[PDB]
């Protein structure tokens, strides 16, 4: 089968011989084994090789983690892609993404938010709200189905939303997902009016 | 499991698990016997007990 995490560790450790790794190489191999899920052994060998093919044009004495993550993104997403040019519509998209992120953080019973970005890679994607992944749920040891456990858990706090002694039912837990999807339209309606409603905030309303 | 035990002519309970390996699931199993009913005749008392 495809190499697992431990197989990834072994393959990257073998193919990292003869190459200069900056700082502690164990941490770099840990991160590039967490961040290369589904990869094949030849893909890991190529990623290790392509890093050492680099650090010549850039004149870096050693292979480092940000550049390693740069090639990790590159070999499976293609071009790095340019950021959205600054405009009034860009400011509105930033406001919409900020309202969606704030309502996501204020929603009880949700997973922690990793990062909210305005600039992404690829072609047909823009701003995004990325939540924590397996490689984040590992460190802070947490149940994989913690999202399902978030209903009946009491007296906890996730992101900016606290839950007291009364647990959220399944009805209230799933009905709390409608507010982040409606917040994009609600920001435009509250801040601009009916004519301020755009196609940027139209897809979540159809899943509400 | 209690109603399956006290219901007459019901399948024997095999295992009752409530989140067995910290997995969010719960089940009450029954032995899949090849004798007795299979498909011969379904009594209304048997169907009411199952319901």
């Amino acid at each position: 089968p495809q190499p697992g995490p431990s197989a990834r560790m072994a393959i990257l450790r073998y193919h990292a011989k003869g190459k200069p790794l900056e700082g502690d190489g164990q941490r770099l191999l840990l991160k590039t084994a967490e961040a290369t899920q589904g990869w094949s052994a030849a893909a890991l060998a190529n990623l290790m090789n392509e890093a050492a093919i680099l650090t010549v044009r850039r004149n870096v004495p050693a292979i480092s983690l940000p550049m390693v993550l740069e090639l990790v993104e590159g070999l499976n997403w293609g071009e790095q892609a340019p950021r959205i040019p600054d405009s009034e519509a860009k400011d509105r998209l930033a406001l919409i993404t900020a309202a969606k992120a704030v309502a996501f953080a204020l929603t009880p019973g949700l997973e922690p938010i990793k990062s909210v970005t305005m600039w992404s890679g690829r072609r047909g994607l823009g701003p995004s709200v990325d939540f924590i992944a397996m490689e984040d749920k590992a460190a802070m040891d947490m149940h994989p189905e913690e999202t399902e456990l978030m209903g009946w858990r009491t007296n906890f706090k996730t992101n900016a939303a606290v839950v007291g002694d009364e647990p959220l039912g399944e009805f209230a837990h799933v009905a709390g997902l409608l507010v982040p999807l409606y917040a994009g339209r609600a920001a435009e309606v509250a801040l601009f009016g009916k004519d301020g409603a755009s196609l940027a905030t139209a897809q979540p309303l159809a899943d509400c | 499991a209690l109603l399956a035990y006290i219901t007459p002519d019901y399948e024997e309970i095999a295992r009752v698990s409530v989140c067995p390996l910290n997995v969010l699931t719960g089940f009450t199993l029954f032995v899949e016997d090849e004798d007795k009913n299979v498909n011969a005749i379904l009594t209304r008392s048997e169907l009411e007990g199952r319901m």
């Binding site: 995490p5 967490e34 397996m134 | 997995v23």
Partner: peptide, 29 residues
């Protein structure tokens, strides 16, 4: 819905990450 196979796979992936750093008979049901 997310089936028990996907749930157990998700559990397995989490466990495998816990093997990578810091270095189950339910499919029938």
């Amino acid at each position: 819905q997310i089936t028990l196979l996907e749930k157990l796979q998700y559990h397995m992936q989490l466990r495998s990450i816990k093997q990578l750093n810091a270095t189950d008979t339910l499919m029938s049901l």
